[PDB]
Amino acid sequence: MKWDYDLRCGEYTLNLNEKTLIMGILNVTPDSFSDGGSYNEVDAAVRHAKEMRDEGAHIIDIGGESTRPGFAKVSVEEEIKRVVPMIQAVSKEVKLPISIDTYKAEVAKQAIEAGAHIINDIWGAKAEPKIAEVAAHYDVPIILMHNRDNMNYRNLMADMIADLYDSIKIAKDAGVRDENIILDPGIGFAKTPEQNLEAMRNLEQLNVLGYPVLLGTSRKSFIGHVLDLPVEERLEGTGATVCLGIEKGCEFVRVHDVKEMSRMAKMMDAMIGK
Amino acid sequence: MKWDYDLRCGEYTLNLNEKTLIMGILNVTPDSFSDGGSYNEVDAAVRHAKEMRDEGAHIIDIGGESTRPGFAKVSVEEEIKRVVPMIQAVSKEVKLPISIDTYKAEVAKQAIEAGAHIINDIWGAKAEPKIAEVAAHYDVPIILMHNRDNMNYRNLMADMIADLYDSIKIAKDAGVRDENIILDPGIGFAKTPEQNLEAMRNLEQLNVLGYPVLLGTSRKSFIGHVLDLPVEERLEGTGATVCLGIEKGCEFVRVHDVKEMSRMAKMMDAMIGK
Ligand SMILES: Nc1noc2ccc(C(F)(F)F)cc12
């Protein structure tokens, strides 16, 4: 139907047409006495990945300390010590494609060497353009998220599309094939609560760019802003964003609560004729 | 905006524009040794109504044995003994409008005398046309649900709209004012699982009739058909139907899980600009 290619992920292949793809969020739980690779640290990660797999995740998204939600000031040297053991163990023990959640070229490169299949970049190849070359080099899919260092829009959606296209250009100029490009509206980033809702409301506009769209709204602050609920009480809110996202044509959803969101995605898929 | 009238419910008034209205389902839990009105029976009902009120319900829908989901063969004499004490106590103790879930004229009449504000008719005034006269008489809103004794459609949606209009005509010919008419697509009734999904997918078509729409998909079988989950494990599925319903412009949702569905409705409302 809509997509005449599959998303190629090394040993794994993701069909973009038959169902909404669920990307499970795995954040590192660092050990306080080591720089990475410890049993408890990695075993925690591996167990969470198996769990999310058993609950219906199609992709495991792995993030070190430098990325969301903590945004630690940490070197690539430090960061690699931490994320590489996780990617090695998860890729070995869990048979799903792995995305590396980083905006750093060198981390992306070593993550892929370690076994990751997809690059997920919260800065859309703008913070470190060479990440697009890494991606082109290894021929992996790259997720380009909308982001910017400010909330001074003239027109939110038009600007979002312009910004994303600037990301696409960096990517293609490095050699990234169209079929390896995925976009993300960057909900919860560089947007007021009202702009996040407005982005949700007009999400279907991203579709004119001709690339698969991943939605990542899970547990985010704007949901708290609407419901006045803390992060642990945001299942219902996340769900609403997921269903609306799917209705507006998104191919992936990046979520913490895989069990619940997979059920909801599956029901949405059935209703919209996916 | 969309509605230039409020829904008038005696002492209560429901705004159709500012938020999706939540209708909480209260089914009778009959005592086995009495025909109605017992303390345990009514106290159970009253407690469930307060609970649903505290959880964000805007309307309490009360059903006796003859209606869904049990469809008991019971006389109006018997049925009144059962539903009247519930309406009396709930209306007294819970300050929300009450809908009576019946297709029987005489039950509707006495329910309204007892304190109910809205008639909810699963047969769309077709089983007992005089229910429309009761409604006109007392000047209460009536919910006309799509239903039929068969699943032999030529074209599902066109037929649904035709059938609903046949209901509208009965209602208006009895004297029911347009502002007192609400429609319901009758999901889960007289439809295959596939037709229920198709009705969900094309729900926005009901809007051309110019009347508020109530959606009632809660825990229904087709959700089980899609997810392969039993009735207690259908929160996520119900939610998906609720969000899609709201996106397609429905004014009410009739649900069992008020807490969860209110949160989800509230988030949807915020995103679509309601
Ligand atoms: N299966 C559940 N247990 O607790 C829940 C809270 C919300 C939801 C929702 F709304 F996301 F479906 C599902 C569940």
Query: Would you call B271 and A200 a contact, using CB atoms and an 8 Å cutoff?
Result: yes
Chain B nearest C-alpha distance from A197 (Å): 5
Structure tokens at B214: 């109530």
Cβ of A55 less than 6 Å from ligand 1: no
Query: Would you call B270 and A241 a contact, using CB atoms and an 8 Å cutoff?
Result: no
B254 catalytically annotated: yes
B220 catalytically annotated: yes
**B159 burial level (CB within 10 Å; 0-12, 13-18, 19+):** middle
* Rounded Cα–Cα distance for residues A24 and A27 (Å): 10
Query: How far is residue B127 from each of residues A1, B75, B102, B122, measured CA to CA in Å?
Result: 44, 15, 10, 9
Q: Is the peptide bond before B85 cis (omega within 30 degrees of 0)?
A: no
Q: Is A257 left (phi over 0), alpha (psi -120 to 50) or beta?
A: beta
Catalytic residue among B126, B191, B220, B234: B220
Chain B residues near residue A264 by CB distance under 8 angstroms = 236-237, 239-240
* Rounded Cα–Cα distance for residues B217 and B227 (Å): 14
* Rounded Cα–Cα distance for residues A107 and A105 (Å): 6
Q: How many residues does chain B have?
A: 274
The rounded Å distance from CA B236 to ligand 1 centre is: 6
Chain A residues near residue B200 by CB distance under 8 angstroms = 271
Strand partners, A118: A99
The rounded Å distance from CA B118 to ligand 1 centre is: 30
Structure tokens at A172: 């293609």
Q: How does DSSP assign chain A, residue by residue?
A: ---SS-EEETTEEE-SSSSPEEEEEEE----TTSSS--HHHHHHHHHHHHHHHHTT-SEEEEE-SSSTTT-----HHHHHHHHHHHHHHHHHH--S-EEEE-S-HHHHHHHHHHT--EEEETTTTSS-THHHHHHHHHT--EEEE---S----SSHHHHHHHHHHHHHHHHHHHT--GGGEEEE--TTSS--HHHHHHHHHTGGGGGGG-S-BEE--TT-HHHHHHH---GGG-HHHHHHHHHHHHHTT-SEEEES-HHHHHHHHHHHHHHHT-
To one decimal place, what's the resolution in Å?
2.0
Question: Which one, of A41, A128, A29, lies nearest residue A119 by Cα?
Answer: A128
Query: Would you call A227 and B266 a contact, using CB atoms and an 8 Å cutoff?
Result: yes
Chain A residues near residue B271 by CB distance under 8 angstroms = 197, 200-201, 240-241, 244
Query: Would you call B244 and A268 a contact, using CB atoms and an 8 Å cutoff?
Result: yes
Query: Would you call A197 and B227 a contact, using CB atoms and an 8 Å cutoff?
Result: no
Return the CA Rg of chain A. Answer: 17
Closest ligand 1 atom to Cα of B257: 10
Structure tokens at A224: 């708290």
* Rounded Cα–Cα distance for residues B217 and A40 (Å): 45
Cβ of A239 less than 6 Å from ligand 1: yes
Question: Which one, of B211, B226, B209, B218, lies nearest residue B253 by Cα?
Answer: B218
Check if A221 contacts B (Cβ < 8 Å): no
* Rounded Cα–Cα distance for residues B171 and B166 (Å): 9
* Rounded Cα–Cα distance for residues A240 and B236 (Å): 10
Closest ligand 1 atom to Cα of A238: 11
| Closest C-alpha to ligand 1, atom 3 | B235
Catalytic residue among A53, A82, A220, A248: A220
Structure tokens at B149: 């004794």
List all residues 6 or more positions away from A105 whose beta carbon is below 8 Å from its beta carbon. Answer: A128, A130, A131, A133, A134
Three-state secondary structure string covering chain B: CCCCCCEEECCEEECCCCCCEEEEEEECCCCCCCCCCCHHHHHHHHHHHHHHHHCCCCEEEEECCCCCCCCCCCCHHHHHHHHHHHHHHHHHHCCCCEEEECCCHHHHHHHHHHCCCEEEECCCCCCCCHHHHHHHHHCCCEEEECCCCCCCCCCHHHHHHHHHHHHHHHHHHHCCCHHHEEEECCCCCCCCHHHHHHHHHCHHHHHHHCCCEEECCCCCHHHHHHHCCCHHHCHHHHHHHHHHHHHCCCCEEEECCHHHHHHHHHHHHHHHCC
Cβ of B235 less than 6 Å from ligand 1: yes
Question: Which one, of A136, A230, A236, lies nearest residue A180 by Cα?
Answer: A136
| Range A1-274 classified under CATH 3.20.20.20 | yes
Query: Which residue from B223, B226, B268 is facing A244, i.e. has the nearest CB?
Result: B268
Q: What does the domain layout of chain A look like in residue ranges? A: 1-274
Structure tokens at B201: 């997918």
Cβ of A6 less than 6 Å from ligand 1: no
Residue B147 exposure: Cα atoms within 13 Å on the Cβ side: 17
Question: Which one, of A87, A105, A107, lies nearest residue A96 by Cα?
Answer: A87
